[PDB]
Nucleic acid binder design. Sequence first.
RNA 1: UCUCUCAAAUAAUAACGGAGGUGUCCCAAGGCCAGCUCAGUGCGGACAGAAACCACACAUAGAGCAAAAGGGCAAAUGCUGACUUGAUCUCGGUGUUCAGUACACACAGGGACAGCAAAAGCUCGGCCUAUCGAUCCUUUUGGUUUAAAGAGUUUUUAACAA
RNA 2: AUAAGUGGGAGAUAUUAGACCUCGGUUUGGUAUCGUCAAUGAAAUACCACUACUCUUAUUGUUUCCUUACUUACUUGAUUA
RNA 3: GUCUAAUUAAAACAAAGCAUUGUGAUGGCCCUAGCGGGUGUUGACACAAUGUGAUUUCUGCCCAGUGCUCUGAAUGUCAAA
RNA 4: AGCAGAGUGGCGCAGUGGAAGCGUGCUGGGCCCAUAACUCAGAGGUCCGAGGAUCGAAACCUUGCUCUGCUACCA
Lengths: 74, 136, 104, 217
Amino acid sequence: GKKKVVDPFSRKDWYDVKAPNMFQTRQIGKTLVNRTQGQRIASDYLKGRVFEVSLADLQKDIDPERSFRKFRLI
Amino acid sequence: GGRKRPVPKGCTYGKPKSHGVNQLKPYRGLQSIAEERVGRRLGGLRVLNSYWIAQDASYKYFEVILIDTHHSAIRRDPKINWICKHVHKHRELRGLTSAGKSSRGIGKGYRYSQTIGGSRRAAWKRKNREHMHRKR
Amino acid sequence: MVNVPKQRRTFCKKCKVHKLHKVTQYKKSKERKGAQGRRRYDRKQQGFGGQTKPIFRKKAKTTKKIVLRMECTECKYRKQTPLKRCKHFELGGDKKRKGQMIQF
Amino acid sequence: MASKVSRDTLYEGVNGLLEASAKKKRGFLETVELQIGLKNYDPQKDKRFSGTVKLKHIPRPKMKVCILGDQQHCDEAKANNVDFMDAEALKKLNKNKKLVKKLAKSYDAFLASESLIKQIPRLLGPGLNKAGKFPALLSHQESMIGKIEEVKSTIKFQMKKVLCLSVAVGHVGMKSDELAQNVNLSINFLVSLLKKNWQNVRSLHVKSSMGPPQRLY
RNA sequence: UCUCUCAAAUAAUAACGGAGGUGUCCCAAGGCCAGCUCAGUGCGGACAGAAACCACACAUAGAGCAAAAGGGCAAAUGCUGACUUGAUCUCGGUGUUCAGUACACACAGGGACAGCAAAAGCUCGGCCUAUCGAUCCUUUUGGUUUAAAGAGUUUUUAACAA
RNA sequence: AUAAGUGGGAGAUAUUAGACCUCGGUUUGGUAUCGUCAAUGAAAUACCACUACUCUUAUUGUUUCCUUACUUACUUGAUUA
RNA sequence: GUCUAAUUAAAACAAAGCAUUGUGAUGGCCCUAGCGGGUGUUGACACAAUGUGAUUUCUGCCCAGUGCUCUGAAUGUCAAA
RNA sequence: AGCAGAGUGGCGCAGUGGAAGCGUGCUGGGCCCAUAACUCAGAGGUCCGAGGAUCGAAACCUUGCUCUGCUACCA
């Protein structure tokens, strides 16, 4: 019988996600992770996750020759 | 603990009053049970008493007081001479040991009026006797 | 339907006078332990002989005789009266009315 | 959350209560109120708290009581310094407001004689009942012998539908000894009125008008 | 359990005899008094006919009195108004059943206290004849009384009366 | 005005001057601020609650209690341990 | 193929086949009051528990009722501690 | 007897102190050749009963009826 307050949005922290070195922009973001409880490992609930963004956009090739080519991050 | 009736798992042949198996309990204390077992193996030593040291779940710890009646120290020395008398052979089974005396329930007075007058068997016999005097 | 008035003038032996009494129904009042036989009753049942005292079944008894508790306003001394068997007891009765319409 | 004089965790004695003079921080004469909670007194049911008490040492009131008086009853009250009116006053009081320096509800309290109790519920009823000044036998306005009571301190007390009772027992500028009799006497009448509850009085309080609560044994 | 009959004219009296009913119903359908006259018929009265309400004459119970049936009754026991709670308290008797006992219900009284009516009187339920239950036990109401056995007090508790 | 309700009620606060004071202060007059009252309602709320509602948080003690850590209890399995 | 030795040898029983049920062993099913043990020097192609009855062919509809079952809303009801 | 739950237009079901609402059925209009279907218009409430509370009760309270489930008791 859990029952949390409400507005769990006003319980989910803040975090920055870094992209890779040899691309261009090593910030790809900031995004909203669960607040670290000693009854939740928020760090593990950042680790297993896999994303895809097309490299063209991150590379910021304005007229994108790279537009198609989809790229995955972990 | 509970001395669960040695029943065949067949229901105990008779009246509903006798149908309890597991809630049926020793009229003899666990002190005495400790003594009687020792006494059969050690039939040459005569048991005075038993006292407790410790208890967890399955077992109760006792130290049992054993006397050598065939040792001339104990023949020797006047206070304990009377224990060498043949009247004290296995006290434990006759409850002349402290454990056994309590289970047989011999206290003066009233709370024990039946059974102090006769030891536990004896009281029954006196009561149920037609004492027929000759000169009726 | 036995209709019964909320007020009845009847004899009360403390006033030694016929005085007005407020009328109430008696009912039956909860079984209590430590009752005299109940203390004994429980020991007798004490367990593994299986339910000692015979369980009364064959109940045809459609009603019960009502007792009215009549309590004198002046001396507060209370008087018991039993009445004859009737299913439906009412007090301040909604007292049946003579000739009454059945209308239009 | 209480001022340094009173600790809110401490149930003050009736002797300790008298320290209401500290709680009149306001330069002017605050009213002392005695504030009682009722428990398992079902307020919707026939357990209806109604009473009057005459407080030995007066709430400091200017009480003008108005009588509708028939026969000897008018005379009786007249001796006891009542405003003195004889049923023909219904028609002055109601229909219109008086004139100058007087409102047609220039009465603090209302009394009507039993003979005159036919006329007032029809005529006076809309204006009086909304005020709550309406004379009931539970409000104990016999105001002749009730008049020496009323001016010299009679307060009525009635249960709210949330089942609370809120009494005025005094003014704070009243000597401590005099306050003690008024709080105890008010209480003693409340105790008389209690219809069979397990714990009819669950907490007793006395509070100053601008000023911090006291919890009372 | 009760009525009528069987049941042979006191009473008693049976069969898986005959026709039936009872576990309730009712603050009046109790209690009391006053007034009234019903079943039914005849004769008048727009709406009114065979039957509606109104009006008079006749009329032994043929009606109505909760109910089964049989008794009973006409300034009532019925019907309608009025006033009410004696359908009460207490103790004893009596009838039935037949030990003429238990029980239930009924009948007449003594001691209370009344209820009603002008009163005389009547009235311990229902005009009479059915309508309901032992001990232990549960419980309440009663006097506020006795005991809880080494003394009190107070909870609890045992009880005696109905 | 939105009184959760409701009892009683016959004013309470801020400022300034004068008198009194050692002084917070007290008395008196004026001034400013809603009001019991006026206004007019279900209760009148200056004047506060007593009971309580619905939201939230800290903290101890207590109680309901779930998970996870150790191995020396117990349990299960293998061996000239 | 079996049986009511001593009145019933069959159409009954069993039976292969067919289908259904539980269980990964600190289990399932089972005995013993208990200790301890059977299946089991067995390991799901096993063991245990059922029902129908070769081959061929067919296996419909019905979980309302009575059994059986469940990671089921499980502050229904609900004991002692 | 303990405890819990249910009863709202004919029917099925919503409703948290100010009011009577939806769907489906039902009636008529119209769409349409016609009906089916749809669209439109109207009709439809002792809120199971009674009483209390409060200015006002389906609403809250309580008692009673009715239904429903478990469970204890037992002269």
